[PDB]
């Protein structure tokens, strides 16, 4: 009769009926992904909507149960997950507008396009029309309009929609005990648990700034060298001590700096390690990559891929006329139906990606024993972190020697480590400030702390002060810039891409140490070290049953996140960055703009 | 008197865990040569009796019970083991003597579009005793108050497996025969 009894049984009809409706929408999603046709689209939606309708019916039934009255915290992790409502709390009049607003923004982002001012006939989409320009251009003019055309058309059309997206999402957030929309979105990290293993919504804001304070000396040194090399690419178009413009950052928004490597390569003469050519000469087509990756994960003491994985999964692009989506994905379909869909050619990147995606499957297999609600990453940033560390270990020249992709005697030159480390900083640290401004900008916008006219004038104000990114053209109140990003314009949290990279090197540092790696942390290879695999699997197998505070401590040995392990990873680069920045400025002035000159 | 003991077990239709059927094939001698073959079986196992010397031992009164648990639930079919299937369905007694057999009927008992024919009690009031079968589909309420769905806290006890041929090894159907070998002649009392 007690709510404790009435909620366990309620999570034995949900769990039993969830696996069927999730699997039917997983097979259907796979069949649409592995065979794009109108017949499969209707099957996917019909089976997908049944689970969505069932979940919403079950979730509202969960809210009748008072969350406070429970005692066992295992089901509280489940009931709290089920009590989550989102737009459901809003009235039918408001929710239909909100779901329209979400659909309108997603359709405006996806089906919207920007046009060349030189060529009005060509109006390229973002993917792949505008991704190609932003990630593979070197001209000031070509990048400028393509950077702003995507924000003067898509962004401004979302400006009125975001204001009601701010307003309505605050109301549903305020319809529960969440003070604003941001507080609702930082409840992924909020934890009620035993003392010391509990986390607060307020604590996240302090901790993100806490790590970011330590990152800035690393970032600004990296910011300065990237700027110093960039100024050669764009002479007289940027200031030597000025903050970085936004249309030369390797992509549209500035999320990653990885596409600046060709123009910011530390040692251009030394080539980057590539085992593609030898792999074709050893006749690896597509099967060896996943069999060898199976051996690599087996070396660290992780289980090998199941029998069903090999047949059911799509491991090559079909020869016959069957259109498929080539984006790699580690499909956890439920009922131990782990699959990988990947158009893998004979290349090292697919070789590394096959280790990446299979890292998701190793995580998926690990927590598959957890209940249906709890079979996920410890927080939103835990599942991607685990996959990433596998790619770091697989790409080490130490590992490639073991599997025969390198000559028995090869030059492990120190110049090719700065090239590897610097290409690993254009991604890891190129996103840490950007992934912090967004939540900082939004949690104030959701709180209203940024003026409506200065929404895009406290955008650069926040950008220059905390990110080093400056406007290349003046922005009025109309041009909604943050809503020109996929996650913001599709109502997705972006802080998960900050804790992930912070946890990525807390895992790696705590796995190379147990592996007894001697030397720098970048050339660490945990291959053949079963000790490292046993340590990670303990964090993997618990899934989401325990707070991310407890899960992180089990592997890293630290209660909360910290960027000290990530500072060690780039320490060989940092000592090389500091010794290269002696002739260059450090820190960014927040009072410069290129259009003024 | 020569009687096959796998010919019947090669039936196209197999009982589910809820409706397991006690096929008493007794008073006849059969060739255990199939029992030795483990290429076709996947859970050749025994409890309290010799597996290789089962042919030698003639003190057997078989109480073969057939049912279809899935791949992850075959380990649930063990004396002293409990789980979703082992406490609301045919429970193996702690002192059960005999052998437990299984094989992966993924081709036969699973369909690429989903096979939901087989049943098992997800919810029950009390504990199902070993060797006890209950035939009832009354709706279950956690408090125990009779009601009619879709009224809140009133669910259906029986649930069905989402059997597929594409699922992982642990989510494929496994036919299970529980041969309860026993000595018929016992001098319990004068
Ligand atoms: Zn991934």
Author numbering:
A (entry chain A): 19 to 615
B (entry chain B): 321 to 510
Kindly provide excerpts from the paper associated with this entry:
SARS-CoV-2 uses the receptor-binding domain (RBD) in the S protein to interact with angiotensin-converting enzyme 2 (ACE2), which is also the receptor of SARS-CoV. The cellular ACE2 receptor is one of the key determinants of the host range. We found that ACE2s from sperm whales, minke whales, dolphins, sea lions, fur seals and hippopotami could efficiently bind to the RBD of both SARS-CoV and SARS-CoV-2 and facilitate the transduction of SARS-CoV and SARS-CoV-2 pseudoviruses into ACE2-expressing cells. Then, we chose minke whale ACE2 and sea lion ACE2, which displayed high binding affinities to both RBDs, for further study and determined their cryo-electron microscopy (cryo-EM) structures in complex with either SARS-CoV-2 RBD or SARS-CoV RBD.
Where SL-ACE2 is concerned, the same seven substitutions are also observed. D23, N33, E35 and T324 on SL-ACE2, but not on hACE2, interact with the SARS-CoV RBD. M82, E329 and R393 on hACE2 are involved in the interaction while their counterparts on SL-ACE2 are not. When comparing the interface residues of SL-ACE2/SARS-CoV RBD and hACE2/SARS-CoV RBD complexes, Y440 on the SARS-CoV RBD exclusively binds to hACE2 while D463 and D480 bind to SL-ACE2. In comparison, E38, Y41, Q42, K353 and H354 on SL-ACE2 form an H-bond network with Y449 and Q498, T500, Y449, G502 and D405 on the SARS-CoV-2 RBD, respectively, while H354 on SL-ACE2 is not involved in an H-bond network with the SARS-CoV RBD.
